Amino acid sequence: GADDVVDSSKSFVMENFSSYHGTKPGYVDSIQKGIQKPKSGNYDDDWKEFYSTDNKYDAAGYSVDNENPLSGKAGGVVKVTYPGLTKVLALKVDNAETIKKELGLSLTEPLMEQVGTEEFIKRFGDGASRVVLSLPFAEGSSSVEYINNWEQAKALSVELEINFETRGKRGQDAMYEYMAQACLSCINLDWDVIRDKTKTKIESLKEHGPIKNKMSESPNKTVSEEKAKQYLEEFHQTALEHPELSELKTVTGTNPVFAGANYAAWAVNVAQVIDSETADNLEKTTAALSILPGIGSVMGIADGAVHHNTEEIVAQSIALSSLMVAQAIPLVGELVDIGFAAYNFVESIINLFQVVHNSYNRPAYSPGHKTQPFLHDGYAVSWNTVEDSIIRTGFQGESGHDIKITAENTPLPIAGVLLPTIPGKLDVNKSKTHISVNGRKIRMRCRAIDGDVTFCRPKSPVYVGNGVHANLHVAFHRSSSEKIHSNEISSDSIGVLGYQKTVDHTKVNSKLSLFFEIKS
Amino acid sequence: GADDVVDSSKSFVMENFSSYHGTKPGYVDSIQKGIQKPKSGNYDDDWKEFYSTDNKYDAAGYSVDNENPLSGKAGGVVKVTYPGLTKVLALKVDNAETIKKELGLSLTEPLMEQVGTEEFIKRFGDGASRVVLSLPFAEGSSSVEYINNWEQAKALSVELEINFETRGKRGQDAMYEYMAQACLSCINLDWDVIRDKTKTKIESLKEHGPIKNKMSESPNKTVSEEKAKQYLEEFHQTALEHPELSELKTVTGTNPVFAGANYAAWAVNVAQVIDSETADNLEKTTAALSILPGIGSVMGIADGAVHHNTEEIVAQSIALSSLMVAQAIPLVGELVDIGFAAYNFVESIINLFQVVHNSYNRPAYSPGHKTQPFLHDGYAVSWNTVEDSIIRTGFQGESGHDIKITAENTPLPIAGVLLPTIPGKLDVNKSKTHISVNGRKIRMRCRAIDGDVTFCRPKSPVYVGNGVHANLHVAFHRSSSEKIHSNEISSDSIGVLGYQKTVDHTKVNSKLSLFFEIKS
What we know:
By secondary structure, the first copy, chain A, is of the alpha+beta class.
């Protein structure tokens, strides 16, 4: 029925309904004369339309130069307003055939065509001058996408929200500073400060005796990739000794992702894929750099956290990466000017920083929460469904909870599982708790540890891998209707235990965590 | 309603309804006198019951000695038959409160109690002498689990299906040879042959000049773990040169998982966790060995396939592993007799082989098929739902397909995606195809490659990692109602491309495959 394709709760009517539209450079002024369909030349006749959104910051992402989409200039965002009263109709599905059939409309005329006809709107407009469809912007987003009938969009009034090119910043800085307003702490850095600090640090580092000497030491010739990495590793060790890098050094030691070997491999990789034509063009540089592994070493991003979180540390890491890439270019080839390290290398990587910082500033589930997998030591585990991750409380009775388990290649063991328990309010049903391995149901033997943890081991050995997967089913029983209190529990996760290894001279199992939420 | 908890299609009535029950050693004869509730001492008052199954081979898995569940003897399987007519009632959920409420029965008396009362059965039995509940055995399984009211189970007639101890085989060989009857080729090996071949190969290998000399060379002293691994690696290289290992050598070279370094690390790991008490006890040996990583090297299992698939190669790998572990024991400690390498080491690992071979012999989805993830190079990708993996054909209109993407730690790029296409019958809708990164919707630029592939790249750089995940949404449009024909397509997978690397002196992207099925 129509409620299968339309959400009446999120449908509504508004007077002067406004929304936002990202606009490419060169059209920021011309679009403000009026919304008009572009010239001929698509993918779905039913979906011809003019697109807008409720989120001006999402709209800013569609404003970059189409001929240089990765690195080009952003135009701006305009606000577009319908005069009068508009019915926004929220959809539950984006399939034109389903929407057409379930709304009793003609299946022979494009959906978006009919949305714009006087019939359809006297019928669905609830007294509105026009009808605009709505859809969920995307998975992981709360924004709203608006689909406007072109003709009806002629009625739109258009004005400026922001012109990114009037700010006169370098690269895409204005666009990303704007998007950062869409609101782990937060990374909201000043990139003019970072760029100036980076140039300053590069010039200043290059005038140190030890670094100058290291520079001389270079083969300054094409040499094998392992020799190049060894020299670059040495260079990194030298430069990090200097005080303009002191903060970097301190973050460097807290994580192997940040070690000199990883900077060396990144710098060698960069020099290997940047030829003279690419070095001269920001877009081509960005496309090349953007497909390399290892950028988290330069970015100080590991374990879900952005560790290079101040303008000072970021400028230090970019400065150091720049001079390492300058050192690596003559060790891989002869035909590329090392000016790339100071110019488009810095310009491009600054752009990549802003993309990734932008991702980490958006709400997202951590590994092991809801349906995001926990990936670790070659395993993948995850809650089968979102409800599995909720442990309901305040009632007598049972619940069951499914956890998917597998591994990437060779067979890896599952040693057991650490579960929460609370006498009366949350006991493990050890009859109904089991692990199914390619459909072989394996029962468990469990013992209590302290008072709030039950540890269960399979009664036959469990292995998972390419082609062998498992379902861990956890059954809890509740003899009391008393609500669980958030300190009767000492962890917020179920701990699946993988293979045994030695961490700092102690034998422990690989830990695979599924985070739960107690509710109700 | 009752149809929310009961499946009338899989419910039925049978005359002389029989099923199977795994029986622990010492109870195979006594159980055949009659089914009886054991003495007092559970987890859910509603679920007191006697359990059976439709699959005698699954039942065989519950027949092992409870005091030695990993490695102990298996009793057998008995067939249990109800005289007369039984109503089997299939359930859709295993929650006693939900089942009780929805079936209009009392919520104050255990479910399984009421199942056994004359009331409930005149009412649901459709003229049956008793009522037995049914449930899905497990995830990934097609077997059926039966839950029998104890009292009503007094009526059961019991006979022998198999006594595993009468076969008089070593270890658990009878149980696993039986389970293998439950039916990539298949691994159905004769383990008496393997054991005899293994003893023979060990004795024969130990009498070679080169291997004897290598033996002398050993420090024969406790030494560092890296020195031990170096010597063991040398030893492995020596033994593989001898003709009784020729088949092993040939499989050895086809895969780095099988290289001498991995055997050495396994053998060192084993020697490190086996003390004298553990070496003397099969169950304790098995519990220790079963939680180690790396067993696929000895098993020849990698990439979803069992490469050591003949009695000859398996006996060669176990023989070689045995003598390596004999060499590693004095290099880690002084208090353990190397007789462990020949006795319980071989006994235990044979048991682990049978467990894993048993897993690979069961039907299962490969990585990237249905909802099993494809794990590779630190990424995880998967179909969001099972229907996403189906591309329907034979109609004009659109479909959409969601692929979850993330990575395990530091930010890794998504370079683009390779998609199937067929003019008219399956075109990419490049307006509605996009990738959402923590809710940031990124559009694509696509180009055709040949005639049946469309390659799409994001218009802003995509990275994923701990805390950053993506949804790839693929929209197809169909201008013809003609059914896709299975040679208009040259691959059965969508290819997500990750970071760039060099494979045999060529630059390629990490390949992440989502396998689809064309249907309808």
